[PDB]
């Protein structure tokens, strides 16, 4: 037991599947219930789950929950599917929620904290989701030289393909054109030939 | 000011790219001090003075206004307008004042 290291508050480590179902929706009680009810299916992200159910829209899953729960309205019903899917996986983001994270956090305005500590904790992490991060994030992987010769061809054909009008359309951001010239490599940081038969048709 | 406060025919628009430095601050350690003095001179003419809303100089050591564009987000949601204008310009409608 390291000094300064302590077991989390109330997180009873010595729990088992043999033990009864915990009576609280938490990160640990749910994934525990997911072990019993679902077996071992532990997806990485939410849309990994959709890939398993083979193309089920959220509102479709929002339907079946509205049946199990007649009290919620429709747009309340869909909210549950996102939760449980985001509870068992990494809670994910959307260009709508990346706006949702702003509206709630901007509404409160400036805090009465001593050094506006929260607002900085908000505004800093805010920048990290902006395109101007994935761009700069790519540069660090570019300077660290983890690409191959096949990628340079792919970056290059991204540069020829953009029109000078798009440059002045991207030089405004001063980051956006880097996202394009490094399009494929920005994602590659995350993630036998059979010729046509050439016979003589005559002989 | 040229663009939206004047007609398209009679407004002179100066382009940014044709400007000396592209019209923005050059990178700091690059241009032999040419650009740094401009913004410095610019800031030296654009720095405020006088007792603001919080009650101190704009250059005070502790009281800092415009924290994360609060005053910027403040005007952005209030809107510099008047109910009296909002009524009148509604009632005028399409017609020109002339």
């Amino acid at each position: 037991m390291y000094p300064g290291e302590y077991v989390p508050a109330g997180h009873n480590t010595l729990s088992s599947l043999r033990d009864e179902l915990r009576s609280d929706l938490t990160a640990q009680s749910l994934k525990e219930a997911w072990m019993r009810v679902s077996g071992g299916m532990y997806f990485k992200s939410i849309d990994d789950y959709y890939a398993s159910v083979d193309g089920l829209d959220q509102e479709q899953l929002g339907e079946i929950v509205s049946a199990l729960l007649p009290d919620l309205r429709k747009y309340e019903a869909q909210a549950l599917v996102t939760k449980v899917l985001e509870s068992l996986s990494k809670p994910a983001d959307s260009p709508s929620r990346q706006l949702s994270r702003t509206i709630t956090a901007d509404a409160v305005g400036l805090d009465n904290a001593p050094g506006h500590y929260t607002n900085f904790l908000e505004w800093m992490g805010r920048m990290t989701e902006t395109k101007a991060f994935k761009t700069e994030h790519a540069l660090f992987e570019f300077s660290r030289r983890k690409f191959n010769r096949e990628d340079v061809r792919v970056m290059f054909e991204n540069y020829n393909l953009m029109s000078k009008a798009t440059l002045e359309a991207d030089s405004t951001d001063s980051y956006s054109h880097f996202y394009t010239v490094l399009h494929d490599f920005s994602r590659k940081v995350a993630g036998v030939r059979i010729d046509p038969a050439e016979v003589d048709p005559e002989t | 000011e040229q663009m939206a406060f004047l007609d398209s025919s009679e407004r002179s628009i100066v382009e940014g790219a044709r400007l000396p430095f592209g019209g923005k601050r050059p990178p700091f350690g690059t241009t032999y001090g040419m650009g740094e003095r401009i913004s410095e001179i610019a800031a030296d003419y654009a720095k405020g003075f006088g007792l603001g809303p919080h009650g101190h100089s704009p250059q005070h050591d502790t009281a800092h206004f415009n924290t994360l564009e609060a005053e910027q987000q403040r005007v952005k949601v209030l809107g510099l307008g008047n109910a009296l204008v909002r009524l009148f310009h509604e009632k005028l409608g399409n017609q020109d004042i002339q």
């Binding site: 029109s163 009008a165 359309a169 | 939206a4 406060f5 004047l6 007609d7 398209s8 020109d96 004042i97």
Partner: peptide, 25 residues
């Protein structure tokens, strides 16, 4: 404003280069 700032025009809504969102459609 009033002093200083169709069906086709609807299609455009949905310099040297912006001419073609007017033209090329």
């Amino acid at each position: 404003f009033r002093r200083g700032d169709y069906i086709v025009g609807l299609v455009q809504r949905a310099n040297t280069y912006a001419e073609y969102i007017q033209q090329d459609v």
